[PDB]
Coordinates of C-alpha atoms in Angstrom, one line a residue:
Chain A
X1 CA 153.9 175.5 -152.3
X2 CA 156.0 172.7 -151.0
X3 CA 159.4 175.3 -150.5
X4 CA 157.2 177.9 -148.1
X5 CA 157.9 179.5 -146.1
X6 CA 161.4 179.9 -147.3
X7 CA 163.0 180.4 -143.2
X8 CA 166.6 181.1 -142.2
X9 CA 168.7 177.4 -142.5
X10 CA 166.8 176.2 -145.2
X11 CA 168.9 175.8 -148.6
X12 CA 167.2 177.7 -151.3
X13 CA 165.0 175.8 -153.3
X14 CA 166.1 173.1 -156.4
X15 CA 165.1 173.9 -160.0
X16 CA 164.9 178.0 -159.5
X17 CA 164.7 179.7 -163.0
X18 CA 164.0 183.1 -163.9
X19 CA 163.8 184.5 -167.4
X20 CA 166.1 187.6 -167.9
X21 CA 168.0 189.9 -171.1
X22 CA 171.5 189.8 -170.0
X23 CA 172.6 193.5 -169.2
X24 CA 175.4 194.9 -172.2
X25 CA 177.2 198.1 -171.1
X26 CA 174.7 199.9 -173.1
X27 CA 171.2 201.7 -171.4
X28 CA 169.4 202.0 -174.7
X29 CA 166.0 201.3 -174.1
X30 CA 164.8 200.6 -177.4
X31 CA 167.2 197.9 -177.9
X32 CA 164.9 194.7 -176.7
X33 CA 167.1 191.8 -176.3
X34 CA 166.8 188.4 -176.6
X35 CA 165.7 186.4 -173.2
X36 CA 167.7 183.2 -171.4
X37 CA 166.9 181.6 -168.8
X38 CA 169.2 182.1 -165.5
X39 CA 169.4 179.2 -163.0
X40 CA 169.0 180.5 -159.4
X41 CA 169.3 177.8 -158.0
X42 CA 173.1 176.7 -159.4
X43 CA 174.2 180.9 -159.2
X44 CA 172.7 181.1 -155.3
X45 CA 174.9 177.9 -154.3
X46 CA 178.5 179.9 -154.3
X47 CA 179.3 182.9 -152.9
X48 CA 176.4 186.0 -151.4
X49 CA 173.4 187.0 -152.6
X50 CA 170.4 189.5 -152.2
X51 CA 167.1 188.5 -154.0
X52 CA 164.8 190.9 -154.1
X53 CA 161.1 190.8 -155.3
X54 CA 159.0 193.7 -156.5
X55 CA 155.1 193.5 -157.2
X56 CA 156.0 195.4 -160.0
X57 CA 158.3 197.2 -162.7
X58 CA 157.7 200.8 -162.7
X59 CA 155.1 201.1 -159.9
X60 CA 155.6 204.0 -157.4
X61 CA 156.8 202.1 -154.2
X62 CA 159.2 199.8 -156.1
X63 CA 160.5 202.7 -157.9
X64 CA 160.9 205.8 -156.0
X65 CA 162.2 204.0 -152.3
X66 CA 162.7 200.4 -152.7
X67 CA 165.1 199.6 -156.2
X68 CA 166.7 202.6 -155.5
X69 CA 167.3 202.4 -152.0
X70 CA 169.3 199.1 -153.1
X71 CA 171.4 201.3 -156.0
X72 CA 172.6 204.0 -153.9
X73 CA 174.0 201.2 -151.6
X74 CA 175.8 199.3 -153.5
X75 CA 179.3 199.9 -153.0
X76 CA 178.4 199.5 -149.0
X77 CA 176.7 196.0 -150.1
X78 CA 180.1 194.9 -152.1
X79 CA 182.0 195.5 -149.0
X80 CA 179.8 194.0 -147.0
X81 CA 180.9 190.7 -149.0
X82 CA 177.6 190.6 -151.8
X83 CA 178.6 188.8 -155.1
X84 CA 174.8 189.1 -156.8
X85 CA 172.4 191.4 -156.4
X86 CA 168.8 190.0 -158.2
X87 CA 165.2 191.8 -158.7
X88 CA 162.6 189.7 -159.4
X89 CA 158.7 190.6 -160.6
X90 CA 156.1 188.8 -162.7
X91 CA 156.5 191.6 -165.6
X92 CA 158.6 189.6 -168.5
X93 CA 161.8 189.7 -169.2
X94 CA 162.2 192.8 -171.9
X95 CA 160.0 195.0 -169.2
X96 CA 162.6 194.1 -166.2
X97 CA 165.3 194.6 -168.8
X98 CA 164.0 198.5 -169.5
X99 CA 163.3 198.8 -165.6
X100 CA 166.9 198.2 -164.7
X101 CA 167.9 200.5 -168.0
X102 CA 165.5 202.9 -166.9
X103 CA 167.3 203.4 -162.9
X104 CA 170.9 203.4 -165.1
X105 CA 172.1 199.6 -164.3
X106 CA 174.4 198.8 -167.6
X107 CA 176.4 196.0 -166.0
X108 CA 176.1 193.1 -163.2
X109 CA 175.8 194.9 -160.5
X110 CA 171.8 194.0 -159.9
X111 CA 170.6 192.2 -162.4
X112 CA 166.5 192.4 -163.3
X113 CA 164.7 189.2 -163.9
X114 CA 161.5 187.7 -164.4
X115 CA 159.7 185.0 -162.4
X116 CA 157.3 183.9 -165.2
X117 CA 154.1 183.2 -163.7
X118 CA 155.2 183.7 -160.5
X119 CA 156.3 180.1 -160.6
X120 CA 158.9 180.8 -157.4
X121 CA 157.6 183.3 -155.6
X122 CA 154.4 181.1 -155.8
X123 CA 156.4 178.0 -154.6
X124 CA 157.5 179.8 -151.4
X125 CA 154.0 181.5 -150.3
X126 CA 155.1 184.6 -151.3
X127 CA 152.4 185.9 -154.6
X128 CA 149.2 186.8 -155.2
X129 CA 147.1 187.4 -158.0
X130 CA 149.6 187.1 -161.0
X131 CA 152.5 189.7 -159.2
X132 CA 154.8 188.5 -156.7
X133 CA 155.2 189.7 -153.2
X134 CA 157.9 192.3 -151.9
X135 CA 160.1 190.5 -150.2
X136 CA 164.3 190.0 -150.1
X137 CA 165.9 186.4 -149.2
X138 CA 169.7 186.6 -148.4
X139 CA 171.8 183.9 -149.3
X140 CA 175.1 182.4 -148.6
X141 CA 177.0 179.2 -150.6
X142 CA 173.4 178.1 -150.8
X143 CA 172.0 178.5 -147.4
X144 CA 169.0 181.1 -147.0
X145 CA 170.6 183.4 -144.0
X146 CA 167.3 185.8 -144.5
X147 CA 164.3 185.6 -145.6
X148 CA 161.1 188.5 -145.2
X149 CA 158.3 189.9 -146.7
X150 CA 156.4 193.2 -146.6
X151 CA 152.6 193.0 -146.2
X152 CA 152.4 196.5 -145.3
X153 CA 151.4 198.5 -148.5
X154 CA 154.6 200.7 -149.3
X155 CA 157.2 199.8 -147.1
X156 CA 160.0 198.2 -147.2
X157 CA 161.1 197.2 -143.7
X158 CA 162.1 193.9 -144.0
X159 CA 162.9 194.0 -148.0
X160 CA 164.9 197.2 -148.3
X161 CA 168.4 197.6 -148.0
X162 CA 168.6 198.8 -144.7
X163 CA 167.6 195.2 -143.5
X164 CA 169.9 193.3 -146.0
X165 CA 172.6 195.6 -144.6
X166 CA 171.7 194.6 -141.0
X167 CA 171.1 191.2 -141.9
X168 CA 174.5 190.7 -143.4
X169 CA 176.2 193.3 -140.6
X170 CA 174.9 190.4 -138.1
X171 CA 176.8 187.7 -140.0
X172 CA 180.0 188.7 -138.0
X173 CA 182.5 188.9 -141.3
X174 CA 182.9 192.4 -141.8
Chain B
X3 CA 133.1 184.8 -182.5
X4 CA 133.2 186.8 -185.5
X5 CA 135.6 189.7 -185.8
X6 CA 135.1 193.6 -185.6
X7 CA 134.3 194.5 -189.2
X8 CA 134.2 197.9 -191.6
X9 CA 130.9 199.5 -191.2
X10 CA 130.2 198.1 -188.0
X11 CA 129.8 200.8 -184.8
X12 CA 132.9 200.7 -182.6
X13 CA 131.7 198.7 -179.5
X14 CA 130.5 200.6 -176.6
X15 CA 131.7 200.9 -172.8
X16 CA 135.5 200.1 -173.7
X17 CA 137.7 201.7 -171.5
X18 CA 141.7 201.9 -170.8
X19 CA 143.6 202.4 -167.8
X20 CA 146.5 205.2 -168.4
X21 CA 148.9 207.4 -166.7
X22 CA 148.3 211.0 -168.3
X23 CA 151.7 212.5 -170.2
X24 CA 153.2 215.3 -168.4
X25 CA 155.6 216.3 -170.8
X26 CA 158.2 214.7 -168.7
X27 CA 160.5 211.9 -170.2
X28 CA 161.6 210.4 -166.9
X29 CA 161.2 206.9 -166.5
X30 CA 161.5 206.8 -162.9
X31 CA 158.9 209.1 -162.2
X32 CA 155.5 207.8 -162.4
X33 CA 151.5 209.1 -162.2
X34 CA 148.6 207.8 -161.5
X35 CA 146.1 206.2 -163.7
X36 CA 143.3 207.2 -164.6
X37 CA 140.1 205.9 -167.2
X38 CA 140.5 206.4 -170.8
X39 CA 137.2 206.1 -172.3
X40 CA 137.9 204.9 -175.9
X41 CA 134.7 204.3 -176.9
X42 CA 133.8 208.1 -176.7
X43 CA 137.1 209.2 -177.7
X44 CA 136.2 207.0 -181.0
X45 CA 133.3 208.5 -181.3
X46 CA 134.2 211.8 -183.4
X47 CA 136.5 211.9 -185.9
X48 CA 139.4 209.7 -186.8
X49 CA 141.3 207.5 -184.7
X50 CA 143.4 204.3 -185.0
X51 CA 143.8 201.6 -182.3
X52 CA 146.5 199.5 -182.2
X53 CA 146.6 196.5 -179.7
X54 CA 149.9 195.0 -179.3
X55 CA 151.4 191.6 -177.6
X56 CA 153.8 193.4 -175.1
X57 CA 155.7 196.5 -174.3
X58 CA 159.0 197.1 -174.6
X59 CA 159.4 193.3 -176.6
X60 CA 161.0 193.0 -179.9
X61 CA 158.9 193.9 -182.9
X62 CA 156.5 195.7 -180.5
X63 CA 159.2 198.5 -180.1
X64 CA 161.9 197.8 -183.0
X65 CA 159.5 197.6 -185.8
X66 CA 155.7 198.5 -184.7
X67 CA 155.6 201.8 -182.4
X68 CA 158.6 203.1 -183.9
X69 CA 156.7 203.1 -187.3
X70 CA 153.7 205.1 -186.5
X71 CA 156.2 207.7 -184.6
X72 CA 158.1 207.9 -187.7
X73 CA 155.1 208.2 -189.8
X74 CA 153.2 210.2 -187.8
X75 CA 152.7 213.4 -189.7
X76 CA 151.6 211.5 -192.5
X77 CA 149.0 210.3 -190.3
X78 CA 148.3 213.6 -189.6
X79 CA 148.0 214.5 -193.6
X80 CA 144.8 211.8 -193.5
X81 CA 143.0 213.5 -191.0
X82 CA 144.2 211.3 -188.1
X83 CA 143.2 212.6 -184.6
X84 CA 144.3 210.1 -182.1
X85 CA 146.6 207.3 -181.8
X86 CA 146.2 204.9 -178.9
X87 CA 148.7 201.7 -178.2
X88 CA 147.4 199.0 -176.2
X89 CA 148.7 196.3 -174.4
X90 CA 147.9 193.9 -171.6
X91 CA 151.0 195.9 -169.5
X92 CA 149.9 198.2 -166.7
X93 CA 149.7 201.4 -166.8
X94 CA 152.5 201.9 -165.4
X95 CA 154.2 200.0 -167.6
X96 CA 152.7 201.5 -170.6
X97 CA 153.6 205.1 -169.8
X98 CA 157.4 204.6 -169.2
X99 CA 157.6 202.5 -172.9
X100 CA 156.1 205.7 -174.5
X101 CA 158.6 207.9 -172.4
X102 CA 161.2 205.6 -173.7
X103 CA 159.7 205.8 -177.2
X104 CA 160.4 209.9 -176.9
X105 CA 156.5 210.6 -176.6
X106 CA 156.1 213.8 -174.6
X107 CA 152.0 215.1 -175.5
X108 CA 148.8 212.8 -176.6
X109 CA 149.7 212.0 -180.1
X110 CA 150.6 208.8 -179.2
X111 CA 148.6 207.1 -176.5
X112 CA 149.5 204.4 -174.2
X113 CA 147.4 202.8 -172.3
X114 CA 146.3 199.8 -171.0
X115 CA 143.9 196.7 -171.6
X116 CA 143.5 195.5 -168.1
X117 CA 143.0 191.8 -167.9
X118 CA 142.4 191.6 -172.1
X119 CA 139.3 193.1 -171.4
X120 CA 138.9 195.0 -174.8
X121 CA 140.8 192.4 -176.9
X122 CA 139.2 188.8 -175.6
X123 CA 135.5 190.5 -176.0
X124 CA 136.4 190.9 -180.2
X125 CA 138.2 187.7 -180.2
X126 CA 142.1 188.9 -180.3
X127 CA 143.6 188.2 -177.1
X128 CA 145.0 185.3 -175.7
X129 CA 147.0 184.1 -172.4
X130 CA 147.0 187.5 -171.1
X131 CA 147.9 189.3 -174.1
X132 CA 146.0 191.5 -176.5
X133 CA 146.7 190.0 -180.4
X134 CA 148.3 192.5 -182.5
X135 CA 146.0 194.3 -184.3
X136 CA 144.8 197.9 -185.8
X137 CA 141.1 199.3 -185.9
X138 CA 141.0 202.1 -187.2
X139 CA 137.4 204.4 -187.1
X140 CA 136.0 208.1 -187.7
X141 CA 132.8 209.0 -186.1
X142 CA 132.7 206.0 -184.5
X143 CA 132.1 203.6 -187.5
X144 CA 135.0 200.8 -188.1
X145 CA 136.4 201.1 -191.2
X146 CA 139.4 198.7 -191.1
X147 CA 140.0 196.3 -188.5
X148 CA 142.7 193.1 -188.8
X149 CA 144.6 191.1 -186.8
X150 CA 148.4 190.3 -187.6
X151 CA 148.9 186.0 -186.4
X152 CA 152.4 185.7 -188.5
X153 CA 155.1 186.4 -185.4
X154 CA 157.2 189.9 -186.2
X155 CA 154.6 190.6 -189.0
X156 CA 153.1 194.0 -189.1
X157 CA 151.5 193.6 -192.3
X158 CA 147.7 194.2 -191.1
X159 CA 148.5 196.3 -187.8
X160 CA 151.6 198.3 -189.1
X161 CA 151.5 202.3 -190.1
X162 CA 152.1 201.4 -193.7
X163 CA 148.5 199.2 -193.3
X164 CA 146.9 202.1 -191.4
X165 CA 148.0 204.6 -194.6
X166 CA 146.6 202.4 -197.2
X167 CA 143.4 202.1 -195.9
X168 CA 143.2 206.1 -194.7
X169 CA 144.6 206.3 -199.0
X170 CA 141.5 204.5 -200.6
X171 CA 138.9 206.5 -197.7

C-alpha cells in the first residue's frame, strides 16, 4: 500500500486499528471475551513500543522460538525503556486472546491482537495470502525507530527479541 | 444449491486437515497435520459432523463444543462412533481449542476445513467461515443434516439436536 515500506523516520501510519479481547488477570481459556477495537495509531504516539507480527497463532515457529523468545525477555525489555509490547496475526481476536492465554500472558505485558484482514500489515507491504508477515517495527512517541521483516522460513533475525533488544540498546538511553 | 438431505450418500472426496492427539494437553506444543479423510471415515457406522463458525469464539466454545463433551457418553449410548468439529481455523488452530477443551484421544475430533472447501461445496459457508451445522450419518447415508442461521442458536447443530434425531433412528 501507500504506508510501505514502513523505514526508520517515518511516523507510523494514521488510522491503525486492530481488533483484540482485553487481557483480565485470569488464563481461562474457555472464557471467550467480547472484542474492541484498539487504536495503534493514537497508543504508538506516546511512549515505546515493539510490534510484532506472526503468520500465525499456534504455528510451530511463532510458538516454540519467536513469542516466547519475546516472554522470557521481558523484564530486560522494561528496563530497556518498552511501555507496550503488541502481537499481531490475521487469526481473530478470540484465537489471539487463547494464544497469549495459552504462553500464560494474564495482564499487559504483551498484548495479542488481530489485524483483520490483514488491513495493516497489507498497507505496509508486509502480507501475503490472508496471514501477515513476520516482522517487528519499533516505535518511539510516534516515530518508527525499526522496522524488519523475516523472509527466511523460521527465523527470526530481524523480528525476534534479540534484534528489538539491539535496536533499542543502539538508541543510547540505557 | 440444494442442501445435504436424509437419505442422501454422504459426498465423496471430502477431506480435513488435522494435527493427530497425542494425549498431551499442552497448547504450546504443536504437530503436524496430516489428511483426515471424512468421507471414508463416514462410511461405516455412525458419525456426526459438526461444522462451526470459529474456534475458540463465544457460543462455539461456551455453548456448542462444551455440549457434545458434556453429553458425550450419551452419544456413546446411541451407537455414536466419531465426533469431528470443523472449522475454517487451521489445523493448528483447531488442535490447541480441543486441548483447551480437555480432549486428550479421538472422541472428539478437530480438524479443519481448509479454505471452506467442505462447507461452500453443500451450500453452508460463507466469507471464510463454515455455517454452523450438524450431519450426522451411519454407513455413509445422511440421516440428519441442518444448518443453525439464528446467531448463538444451537438449536439444529447442538448435542441435544444430534440426540433427538439418534432417539427416533
Amino acid at each position: 500500500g501507500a504506508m510501505a515500506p514502513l523505514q526508520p523516520g517515518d511516523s507510523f501510519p494514521a488510522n491503525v486499528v486492530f481488533s483484540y479481547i482485553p487481557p483480565t488477570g485470569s488464563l481461562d481459556l474457555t472464557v471467550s471475551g467480547r472484542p474492541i477495537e484498539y487504536n495503534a495509531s493514537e497508543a504508538l504516539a506516546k511512549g515505546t513500543s515493539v510490534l510484532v507480527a506472526v503468520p500465525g497463532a499456534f504455528t510451530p515457529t511463532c510458538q516454540e522460538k519467536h513469542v516466547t523468545g519475546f516472554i522470557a525477555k521481558l523484564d530486560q525489555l522494561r528496563q530497556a525503556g518498552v511501555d507496550r509490547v503488541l502481537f499481531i496475526a490475521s487469526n481473530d481476536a478470540f484465537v489471539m486472546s487463547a494464544w497469549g492465554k495459552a504462553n500464560g500472558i494474564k495482564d499487559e505485558s504483551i498484548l495479542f491482537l488481530s489485524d483483520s484482514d490483514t488491513a495493516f500489515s497489507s498497507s505496509i507491504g508486509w502480507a501475503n495470502a490472508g496471514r501477515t508477515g513476520r516482522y517487528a517495527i519499533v516505535v518511539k512517541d510516534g516515530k518508527v525507530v525499526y522496522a524488519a521483516v523475516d523472509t527466511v522460513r523460521g527465523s527470526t533475525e530481524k523480528s525476534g527479541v534479540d534484534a528489538v533488544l539491539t535496536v533499542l540498546g543502539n538508541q543510547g538511553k540505557l
